[PDB]
Amino acid sequence: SKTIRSRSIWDDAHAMLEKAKAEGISTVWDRAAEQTPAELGTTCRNCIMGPCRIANRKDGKMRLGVCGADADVIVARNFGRFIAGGAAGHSDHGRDLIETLEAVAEGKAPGYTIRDVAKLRRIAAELGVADAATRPAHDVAADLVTICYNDFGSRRNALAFLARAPQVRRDLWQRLGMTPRGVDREIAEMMHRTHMGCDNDHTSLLVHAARTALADGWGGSMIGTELSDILFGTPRPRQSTVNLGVLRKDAVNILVHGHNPVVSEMILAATREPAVRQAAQDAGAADINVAGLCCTGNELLMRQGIPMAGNHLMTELAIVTGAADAIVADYQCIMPSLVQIAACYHTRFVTTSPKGRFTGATHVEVHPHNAQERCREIVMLAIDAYTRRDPARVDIPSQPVSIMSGFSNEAILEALGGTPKPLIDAVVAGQIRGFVGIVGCNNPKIRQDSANVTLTRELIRRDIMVLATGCVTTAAGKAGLLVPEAASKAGEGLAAVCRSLGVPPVLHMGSCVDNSRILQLCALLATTLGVDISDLPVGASSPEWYSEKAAAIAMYAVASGIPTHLGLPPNILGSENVTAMALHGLQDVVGAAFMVEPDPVKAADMLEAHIVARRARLGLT
Amino acid sequence: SKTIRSRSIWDDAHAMLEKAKAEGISTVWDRAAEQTPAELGTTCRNCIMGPCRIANRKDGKMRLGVCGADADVIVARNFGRFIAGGAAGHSDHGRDLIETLEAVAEGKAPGYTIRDVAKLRRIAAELGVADAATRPAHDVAADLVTICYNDFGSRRNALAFLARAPQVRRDLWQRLGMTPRGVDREIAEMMHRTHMGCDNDHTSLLVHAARTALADGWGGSMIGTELSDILFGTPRPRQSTVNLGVLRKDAVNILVHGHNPVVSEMILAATREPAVRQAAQDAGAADINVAGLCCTGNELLMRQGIPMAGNHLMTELAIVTGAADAIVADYQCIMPSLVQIAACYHTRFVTTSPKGRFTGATHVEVHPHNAQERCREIVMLAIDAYTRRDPARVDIPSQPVSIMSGFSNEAILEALGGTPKPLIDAVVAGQIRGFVGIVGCNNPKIRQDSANVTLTRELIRRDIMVLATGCVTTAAGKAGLLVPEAASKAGEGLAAVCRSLGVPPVLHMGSCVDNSRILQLCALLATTLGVDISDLPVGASSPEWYSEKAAAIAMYAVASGIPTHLGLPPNILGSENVTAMALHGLQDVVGAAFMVEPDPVKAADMLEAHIVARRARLGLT
């Protein structure tokens, strides 16, 4: 009920921003307003002959760096390191899941099992494990771990999951020098290329940026997605709820934050132990309430139906409620300001990873061999914090909103009858004109979820099915769009298909790493049709992205032949040639390009224009 | 004979800077003067919630980033990415040498052999190859390649060459979480840690920075050094010459630039073919003159006695001579301004690597399977450029200066009688008070080689033997310090030892990657003495460093227990805690620390003060 309303579209955010304003708590929006004044990407710090800056000064000076690099090279090198940082996040995510499966195969991970033995055999046989369908599971698991570790090596010509792509798409990557060879190798070669006096050509630098992101989507992310299903079960459609109202004043509230489900799944298992449940009652709690934040919340939402408290810009406001008893975090997108805001209350801020360290946090390092023991200790710290909660400062806003989740590729095919042919024929008729994966973050520079939900409504109204992943899940869920009754907000053709299957017009497909499910579905549809991915009526969008990670997702979507839209532009506008390559040049190279547009309705026209063109290229109506 | 004399201390540089000034050619010093105005390291660009800047403004604003990161985290994350970029350069260097040995073992590299079969067996047996001393060589080579590739993997607990370090040093790394596990893995985890909301603790970020650089020195660099000896021969002491006078007006001048000897060794072999030599005579050339630049020149200097034309800030002035007929470059430290300056003349600028691309250059991509064929084509392009040379613009300055090179650890031990005991007893007596490895680059912010040669004279005068690598070789060589007669410029004790062995007081130990030879020697002396590397009277210095690569070398020297001096400071002064950790905090952790001092005489006192303290700790005189 102030200028706070210009920061978010949701009521629970307005209620907590007013509560933070009264209690004198600075939020991300406050710090974003101070850092309002390097956005052109024409500043280089790669060596101490600089730092250099490229300008169009009237004197003609500062046109080149000290080494002689121009604006094209400097912008390309900064952009490549931007993509590499995003690929490195998904790289360690998949690597931690590889190490967890190996620990299960060796019997050294108490509490972890192989939840989906059927998927273990199918994935292993697909990647080349001999007799994967009939050998003992732990032996099959060990061979799959070897293949995955070799993709984090330096001897392969191409990643294992790259075989899912159509043949014409693989033959295109090979001719371009774009085929990803190793998940860690392409990250290291990107840092090598952007060193002084190495790669000084903006075209080859951008080609390697696509190759690095392809090592993310078809490598690190896809390995992380498929091993999570093997270790924790393949997600199936199920109902749950979102927004801050999922917190309970009468229960211990444990907020899991981060990305890796290896930690959050064992936290949930610890809260269900009888001795731990009894201890929560001794503290006077009716139950232990686990709620999810960001991607690790998407993980528990897809496989366990655990309610989600919020997304990126909601994590601070979740502690302002005064009901957060513990924040369990591993790594990625955990703003360090959470530690200071948790100090204002009783909230116990716990970190679990050697990579996710925070100055002033309670560190309980979790590993596969002691996860079951350490997570029990973590839940006890939450129960203890419940005893010290300040009752006069608890104000859980709003009421929870119903959602439906768990739409993996296996679940989508099961609703279709085990075959993509019903989905194809619906696209042939003209009921579903195309698919668009809406993915990405929030960003304080844009009213929270305003562009995410707007584009989602515009697309489903034009008979375009939306595949939601990442923090957009919270945006779509709180808009009432993740239920089968949301078909009334879709066009006539899409609504008829949704009511036939009992599914919503927006399918939740998981966390950010689960964007590999979209690649898997796009590769499966292009394979059955016999065409390239650049021929399918597909699209991708990140209207409110912020991280290096979303840029890497957008990059490997473009490199795979999916026209990708970005709300805010990357720090590349200081070079017209790099800008012309990203926006127009890539269209000839890989069959897709980036789209920068802050207007979500206009972006719906551009996404639909690409889709109708690809429908024409298929000779469809 | 102007203010040009304030840019370099050498006559050949003054002659070419005057020649470039007359011909209207802008040099690095010209571009350095324009970029005189991010040096504090308190600017962050890791996401598009920023870019943010940390300041001490009177209003108290801009103290944190949009995510809430303070000055400690931002400076630490920028410094970690700085170290990672340097480690990535040595990583790809070692990886290309692994791929070359594998191609030799498979018989798919025409022109390449195993030059040092004896060293192949010793290295392989050291790293764990079974029956490495008696099995066929190509089978032994294949097993060694497997071990090296696994160090570029993600399954090891520690790199293979880490066994050379003393046990107490390895046990120190393991307790600190500093043990390097994989060359590419530590680079990827550094980019993951520096993502938003991952590692937000300046201590753990710096600990991983040391671990990343240790993966360089004991991993990428050491693999690259030892495989180069296996493929091209172990260097032995030999005489050669330096400075621009090594170019011949009566011969075809081929300037090899970059780092990888896989390319420059085959260029040299092509210039010695009879049909190619005959073609140079047909063009009117008396011979084909190959000269080295930067580290690839150090490679050919150590193993072939090929004269060196110059170092970093000499590469542009080498083309101004008008006698450069071809520049053959692979990657690293090849300033893109060379392409424009070569265009001013007849010089043919050739690139050979997929990673080292330059807009406007003649690209002849070289690989092990076609190196012998492509390099012959490259030399023919140089002979052709000799026919188009402008005679009125050729002015080769100065006269060549004699040097002695090829002092590997194997050559040092051979001069000592096959045992380090003569070297130890000389340090016990007080003749050689300590060893200091002078390494690093040039930097336009400092008068060229003024601090490099000054410190070299100060150290040898105080009876401290200097081990020279990298671009400091050109500085020491042109100062007449790389000959046995230079003992007259050393103290009484050091001069007596040098005249006994017939060696100079400054030992040339190779290129930048050959800094692993210094680690190998420091580990060997600490092992025979039974103490830690932090107990040996050793030191390291980079008075005129510029690259991410020298910072990684300085970092893994500190992490190995060697007090390291830097002329210019890294971009870390915006955080006192990070500065206090690098300068003082690391002394308690790893037994050494960084030393920032622009005064070379003062740095000689600080290096000697550390050495005399370690001599006292050993109870020596």
Ligand code: SF4
């Ligand atoms: S790499 Fe070149 S442009 Fe970048 S800081 Fe160094 S000299 Fe300047």
Ligand code: SF4
């Ligand atoms: S990571 Fe934090 S400090 Fe860096 S640009 Fe993003 S919001 Fe600013």
